Amino acid sequence: PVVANYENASMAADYIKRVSNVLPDIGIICGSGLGKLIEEIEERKVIPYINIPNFPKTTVAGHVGNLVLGSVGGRKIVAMQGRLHMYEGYSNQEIALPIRVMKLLGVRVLLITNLAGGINRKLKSGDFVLIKGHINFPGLGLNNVLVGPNQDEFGPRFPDLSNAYDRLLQQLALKIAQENDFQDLVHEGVYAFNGGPTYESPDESNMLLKLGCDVVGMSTVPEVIIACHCGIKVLAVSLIANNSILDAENDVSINHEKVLAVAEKRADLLQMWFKEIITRLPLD
Amino acid sequence: PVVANYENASMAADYIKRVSNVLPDIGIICGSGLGKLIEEIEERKVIPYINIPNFPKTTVAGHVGNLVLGSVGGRKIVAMQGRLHMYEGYSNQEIALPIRVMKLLGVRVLLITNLAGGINRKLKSGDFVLIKGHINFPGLGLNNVLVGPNQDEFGPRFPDLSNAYDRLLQQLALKIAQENDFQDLVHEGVYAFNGGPTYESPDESNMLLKLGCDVVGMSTVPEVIIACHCGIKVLAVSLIANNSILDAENDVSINHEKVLAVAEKRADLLQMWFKEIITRLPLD
Amino acid sequence: PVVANYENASMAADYIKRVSNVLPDIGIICGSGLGKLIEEIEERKVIPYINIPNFPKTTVAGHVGNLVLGSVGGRKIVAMQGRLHMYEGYSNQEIALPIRVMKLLGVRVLLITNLAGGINRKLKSGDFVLIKGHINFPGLGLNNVLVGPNQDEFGPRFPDLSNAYDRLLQQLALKIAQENDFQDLVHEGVYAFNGGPTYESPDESNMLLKLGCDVVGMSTVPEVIIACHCGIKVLAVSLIANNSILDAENDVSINHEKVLAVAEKRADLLQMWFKEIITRLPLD
Numbered sequence: 001p002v003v004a005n006y007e008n009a010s011m012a013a014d015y016i017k018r019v020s021n022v023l024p025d026i027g028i029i030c031g032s033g034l035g036k037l038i039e040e041i042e043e044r045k046v047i048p049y050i051n052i053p054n055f056p057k058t059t060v061a062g063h064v065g066n067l068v069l070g071s072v073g074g075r076k077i078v079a080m081q082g083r084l085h086m087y088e089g090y091s092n093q094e095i096a097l098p099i100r101v102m103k104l105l106g107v108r109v110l111l112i113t114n115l116a117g118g119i120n121r122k123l124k125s126g127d128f129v130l131i132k133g134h135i136n137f138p139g140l141g142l143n144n145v146l147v148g149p150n151q152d153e154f155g156p157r158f159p160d161l162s163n164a165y166d167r168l169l170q171q172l173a174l175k176i177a178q179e180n181d182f183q184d185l186v187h188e189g190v191y192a193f194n195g196g197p198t199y200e201s202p203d204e205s206n207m208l209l210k211l212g213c214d215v216v217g218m219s220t221v222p223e224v225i226i227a228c229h230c231g232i233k234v235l236a237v238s239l240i241a242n243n244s245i246l247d248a249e250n251d252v253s254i255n256h257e258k259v260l261a262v263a264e265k266r267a268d269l270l271q272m273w274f275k276e277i278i279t280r281l282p283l284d
Numbered sequence: 285p286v287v288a289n290y291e292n293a294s295m296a297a298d299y300i301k302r303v304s305n306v307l308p309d310i311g312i313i314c315g316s317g318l319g320k321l322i323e324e325i326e327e328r329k330v331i332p333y334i335n336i337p338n339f340p341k342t343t344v345a346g347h348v349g350n351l352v353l354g355s356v357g358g359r360k361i362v363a364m365q366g367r368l369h370m371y372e373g374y375s376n377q378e379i380a381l382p383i384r385v386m387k388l389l390g391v392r393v394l395l396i397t398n399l400a401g402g403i404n405r406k407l408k409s410g411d412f413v414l415i416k417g418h419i420n421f422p423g424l425g426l427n428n429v430l431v432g433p434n435q436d437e438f439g440p441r442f443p444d445l446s447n448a449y450d451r452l453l454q455q456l457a458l459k460i461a462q463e464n465d466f467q468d469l470v471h472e473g474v475y476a477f478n479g480g481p482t483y484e485s486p487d488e489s490n491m492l493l494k495l496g497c498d499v500v501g502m503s504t505v506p507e508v509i510i511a512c513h514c515g516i517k518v519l520a521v522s523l524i525a526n527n528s529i530l531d532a533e534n535d536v537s538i539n540h541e542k543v544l545a546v547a548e549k550r551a552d553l554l555q556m557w558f559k560e561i562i563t564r565l566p567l568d
Numbered sequence: 569p570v571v572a573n574y575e576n577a578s579m580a581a582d583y584i585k586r587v588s589n590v591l592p593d594i595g596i597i598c599g600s601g602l603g604k605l606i607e608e609i610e611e612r613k614v615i616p617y618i619n620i621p622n623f624p625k626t627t628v629a630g631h632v633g634n635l636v637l638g639s640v641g642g643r644k645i646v647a648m649q650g651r652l653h654m655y656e657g658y659s660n661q662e663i664a665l666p667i668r669v670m671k672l673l674g675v676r677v678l679l680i681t682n683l684a685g686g687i688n689r690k691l692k693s694g695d696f697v698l699i700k701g702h703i704n705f706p707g708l709g710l711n712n713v714l715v716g717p718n719q720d721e722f723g724p725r726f727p728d729l730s731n732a733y734d735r736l737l738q739q740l741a742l743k744i745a746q747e748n749d750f751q752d753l754v755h756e757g758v759y760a761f762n763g764g765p766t767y768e769s770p771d772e773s774n775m776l777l778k779l780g781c782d783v784v785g786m787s788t789v790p791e792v793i794i795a796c797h798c799g800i801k802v803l804a805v806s807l808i809a810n811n812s813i814l815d816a817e818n819d820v821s822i823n824h825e826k827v828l829a830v831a832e833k834r835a836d837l838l839q840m841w842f843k844e845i846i847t848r849l850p851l852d
Contacts, residue, residue, distance in 0.1 A: 060433045089432040133771040140772065141425030141709030142763030148657040149628045150765070160821045161769045190771045195426030197434070198509060201445045203417040203474045204424065207495050211775050225766060253444045344717045373716040425709030479710030481718070482793060485729045487701040487758045488708065491779050537728045 004096035006153040008054045012097070013104035015053050020045040022069040024078035026278060027099075027107040027232070029223060031114040031239060033263025036271045037072065038079050044070035049082070056084060056094035067098075073279035078105060086138070087196035087218055092145050099226040100154055109169070109281060110227045111274060112236045115259050116217030117200060118243040119208050120189060125243070125262055127185050128177075128270075129215050130170045131236040134161075134191045135208075136221050143195070145222040146229060155229035164228040169235040169277075176276050182269065189214030191238060193221040202248035209245055216244065235277070239266055288380035290437040292338045296381070297388035299337050304329040306353040308362035310562060311383075311391040311516070313507060315398040315523060317547025320555045321356065322363050328354035333366070340368060340378035351382075357563035362389060370422070371480035371502055376429050383510040384438055393453070393565060394511045395558060396520045399543050400501030401484060402527040403492050404473060409527070409546055411469050412461075412554075413499050414454045415520040418445075418475045419492075420505050427479070429506040430513060439513035448512040453519040453561075460560050466553065473498030475522060477505040486532035493529055500528065519561070523550055572664035574721040576622045580665070581672035583621050588613040590637040592646035594846060595667075595675040595800070597791060599682040599807060601831025604839045605640065606647050612638035617650070624652060624662035635666075641847035646673060654706070655764035655786055660713050667794040668722055677737070677849060678795045679842060680804045683827050684785030685768060686811040687776050688757060693811070693830055695753050696745075696838075697783050698738045699804040702729075702759045703776075704789050711763070713790040714797060723797035732796040737803040737845075744844050750837065757782030759806060761789040770816035777813055784812065803845070807834055 002008055017023075022045060028037065049055040049065040058065045065082035080098060084090050102110070116129070123129065138144065150157040170188065177183040192208050194200055196218030200208065208216055215238050227234050241259040246252075286292055301307075306329060312321065333339040333349040342349045349366035364382060368374050386394070400413070407413065422428065434441040454472065461467040476492050478484055480502030484492065492500055499522050511518050525543040530536075570576055585591075590613060596605065617623040617633040626633045633650035648666060652658050670678070684697070691697065706712065718725040738756065745751040760776050762768055764786030768776065776784055783806050795802050809827040814820075 086426055087428070087431050134769055135771055135775055136766075136769065137421075137424040137705075137709070138426035139764075139766060140705040140762050141421070141427070142654055142706035142711035143426035143709070144655070144763055144766060146765050147655050147763065156824065158765050158767060158824045160767050160823060162816070162819065162821050164769070194424050195428055195431065196423075197430050197442050198420075198423060198428060199442060199444050201418055201420065201448070203419055203496065207419055210495065211778065212771065248446070251446065253446050255444060256440065256442045370710055371712070371715050421705075421708040422710035425705070425711070427710035478708050479712055479715065480707075481714050481726050482704075482707060482712060483726060483728050485702055485704065485732070487703055487780065491703055494779065532730070535730065537730050539728060540724065540726045 002054050002093060002097065004093045004100055005151050009097055009100040009104055011053045012055060012101045016047060016067065016105060019047055020069040022076055023106050024069060024076045025106060025108055026075055026077045026281065027102040027110045028077055028079040029083060029110065029112045031263065033260045034113050034239065034267055034270055035081065036267050037274055038068050038081055040072055040275065041068055041070035044068060054097060056090060056097065058082065058084070061088050073275050075278050075281065078102060078107060085219055086222055092148055095145055095222050096226045099223060100230060103154065103230045103232060107232055109233045112220055112223060112234065113270060114217050114219045114238050115241050115263060116215045116238040117254065118240045119205060119216055119245055120214040121245065123187060123240050123243055125240060126266055127187060127240040129238040129240060130173055130186065130188045131191045131238060132165050132170060132188045134193060134221050135211065135213055136193050138193060138195050145225050155231065159229050161228060164224050164234060165236060166233040169233060172280060173235060173237065173277055176273060176280065191221065192216040194218055199254045200244055205244040205248050215240065239263060239270065286338050286377060286381065288377045288384055289435050293381055293384040293388055295337045296339060296385045300331060300351065300389060303331055304353040306360055307390050308353060308360045309390060309392055310359055310361045310565065311386040311394045312361055312363040313367060313394065313396045315547065317544045318397050318523065318551055318554055319365065320551050321558055322352050322365055324356055324559065325352055325354035328352060338381060340374060340381065342366065342368070345372050357559050359562050359565065362386060362391060369503055370506055376432055379429055379506050380510045383507060384514060387438065387514045387516060391516055393517045396504055396507060396518065397554060398501050398503045398522050399525050399547060400499045400522040401538065402524045403489060403500055403529055404498040405529065407471060407524050407527055409524060410550055411471060411524040413522040413524060414457055414470065414472045415475045415522060416449050416454060416472045418477060418505050419495065419497055420477050422477060422479050429509050439515065443513050445512060448508050448518060449520060450517040453517060456564060457519060457521065457561055460557060460564065475505065476500040478502055483538045484528055489528040489532050499524065523547060523554065570622050570661060570665065572661045572668055573719050577665055577668040577672055579621045580623060580669045584615060584635065584673060587615055588637040590644055591674050592637060592644045593674060593676055594643055594645045594849065595670040595678045596645055596647040597651060597678065597680045599831065601828045602681050602807065602835055602838055603649065604835050605842055606636050606649055608640055608843065609636055609638035612636060622665060624658060624665065626650065626652070629656050641843050643846050643849065646670060646675060653787055654790055660716055663713055663790050664794045667791060668798060671722065671798045671800060675800055677801045680788055680791060680802065681838060682785050682787045682806050683809050683831060684783045684806040685822065686808045687773060687784055687813055688782040689813065691755060691808050691811055693808060694834055695755060695808040697806040697808060698741055698754065698756045699759045699806060700733050700738060700756045702761060702789050703779065703781055704761050706761060706763050713793050723799065727797050729796060732792050732802060733804060734801040737801060740848060741803060741805065741845055744841060744848065759789065760784040762786055767822045768812055773812040773816050783808065807831060807838065
């Protein structure tokens with residue numbers, strides 16, 4: 001049933017270290033349609049999940065499932081190609097293990113993107129939101145990704161999340177957007193985690209507006225919590241597919257096809273942005 | 285462990301088709317104490333769940349468990365006699381399969397009733413509420429009925445719920461209430477799904493009032509989401525057992541005995557109402 | 569998989585009755601660092617959980633796990649030394665069984681303490697809060713401790729929680745605080761149940777403030793609901809470790825070390841308080 005413990009994560013890391021010969025400092029997890037950066041991986045090594053000891057089985061959902069290692073912007077990185085989402089039914093242990101493997105591989109910074117709905121009236125389709133905090137409905141409701149025995153080797157029983165979204169990384173991301181004159185697309189905000197897989201209902205959207213949420217999505221918070229637990233710094237950026245409040249007012253529906261079209265519209269800019277961020281990251 | 289997939293649903297539908305010789309266009313799921321309509325089933329065929337391949341086992345909870353087919357108001361219908369509720373511990377797969385069997389049987393419209401608590405100050409015991417939207421706390425909290433692999437043959441990975449409660453069906457229900465001069469009992473509103481089985485606490489009721497909820501109950505939203513996913517139109521009506529906000533202000537308790545007494549008070553009127561709705565439904 | 573049913577609870581109670589020769593009227597469950605009262609147990613009998621038929625296995629988490637019986641303040645009591653929390657991954661059945669064993673042993677009143685975060689601006693580190701109601705996010709989200717088959721021998725399918733926190737017991741606790749001149753430390757309030765194990769995020773804290781929550785913690789509500797279901801009266805007291813709203817405004821982190829330091833600061837006073845409450849409890 002593979003628990004995301006020290007022994008099991010170590011066995012996966014040992015396999016990866018041997019096969020790739022890359023020691024990554026940075027990890028990357030991408031939103032759907034936002035995977036182009038993994039094409040710029042120089043000296044790349046592709047490792048199917050299915051080959052890695054103790055990695056989660058992903059064949060029921062299918063589609064791509066690779067760990068990709070190599071160099072971006074002069075830095076060594078490890079990327080997940082084929083993301084695990086909790087609405088697919090993956091367990092807490094299955095979500096946690098690949099991030100803890102990143103930790104054992106030497107990852108100190110995790111960069112994450114996702115697609116999400118805009119709740120704040122200021123947000124438009126195609127905007128970026130630097131996530132500065134979250135409202136974790138699964139966590140409040142006994143489905144926190146850390147429910148279960150604590151793995152002491154990685155972190156504490158009761159983590160504090162007040163610094164889960166690194167302030168310096170947010171400031172660096174904004175700086176680079178300003179230098180390249182697309183800062184008008186960049187916002188900061190609070191992310192509500194909707195477990196999914198149904199989109200927020202119109203009345204759910206309205207409730208989230210009342211509760212001080214700026215953005216809503218079905219991902220990212222579980223990964224953030226596992227990273228924070230084991231001391232990995234996180235930058236999380238949402239690409240806004242739509243404004244759910246406006247759509248509710250106008251009786252307009254959300255669909256994944258529209259979402260992917262927005263991802264295609266911004267994928268190249270997001271790639272350029274994150275490549276520069278990687279280049280500008282501290283060597284420490 | 286029977287997954288609610290295409291193959292398993294097909295095997296159940298094939299058994300039912302053979303035994304009943306009825307091709308239903310309408311499905312019906314009833315609230316507790318609101319099952320009288322299933323007595324007007326003409327040319328009826330009763331099929332115990334326990335006889336149907338792949339139907340959920342319900343013997344731990346016990347009580348009645350039949351699929352009933354036949355004719356109401358000149359239309360062919362299929363009804364669940366003995367409802368599956370998620371607070372009993374049924375899985376996502378167990379809730380989903382009977383609705384997907386309805387889909388394969390040919391159901392295009394699902395009519396659902398339930399008993400619920402009033403939050404909106406305008407609501408009194410014995411009132412009806414046409415549900416026009418919902419706040420799905422289990423869904424926000426990673427217990428959405430669709431969590432797990434998607435069954436592509438039935439619907440999309442990410443459904444939009446903005447039209448989950450059919451507007452035309454709401455308007456028809458209200459029209460019939462007006463013709464029979466009981467429209468003063470009929471409201472529209474937003475339904476909060478409390479997983480249950482404890483009634484909303486007084487402070488939970490107060491919170492729901494702040495969040496724009498009109499009614500709260502422990503059912504119906506899972507069925508609505510499975511129906512919406514596979515393209516079945518839904519009319520959902522709550523019978524109000526009590527006003528939870530007033531009861532909290534007056535330190536008055538809710539109990540199931542009082543709830544069933546309200547169901548008995550309105551069961552015959554609800555039967556007449558729904559029979560007329562069935563008669564007036566489009567042939568398409 | 570041991571269900572918390574009548575037969576299984578009876579087997580545990582029969583073992584305990586034989587080994588201890590104590591018939592307790594009062595049960596006690598303590599917050600972390602607040603276990604000193606279990607040192608004043610006169611004529612004490614210590615029974616490891618691992619020896620009791622059908623008790624939950626707790627070796628993965630480890631640490632102490634004893635049932636302690638004996639006399640406090642002239643009354644016969646049973647205490648849990650080593651508390652089961654749902655964020656550890658224990659099931660509904662594992663949480664419920666020890667409280668139902670208390671019921672079969674003859675417990676009529678359950679006294680519970682916990683450590684929690686202050687949301688209400690009036691609350692300071694070291695304050696006590698008499699819990700008068702709750703917001704149960706796991707319950708709203710389909711993780712209520714009673715989800716599953718109902719055990720009819722203990723209580724009803726649909727409990728009402730409006731009297732879950734006994735008013736007379738709250739008044740008695742306050743009276744004793746007044747007599748001993750520490751009533752300035754004592755508040756009353758509404759408790760939000762955060763499943764855990766991560767502390768409330770700063771934005772979650774802000775949301776809880778908007779929703780009328782006074783205190784937030786990761787315990788106690790499951791035990792309250794099982795006790796209420798089987799007719800045991802409850803007094804629940806939170807010791808405030810910090811004010812989460814102030815900490816968010818000042819960018820100050822919460823950690824368990826700080827929490828335990830507050831418990832140490834108030835443990836002796838809480839012991840004296842609860843011993844007096846036990847002495848003053850009705851003989852009925």
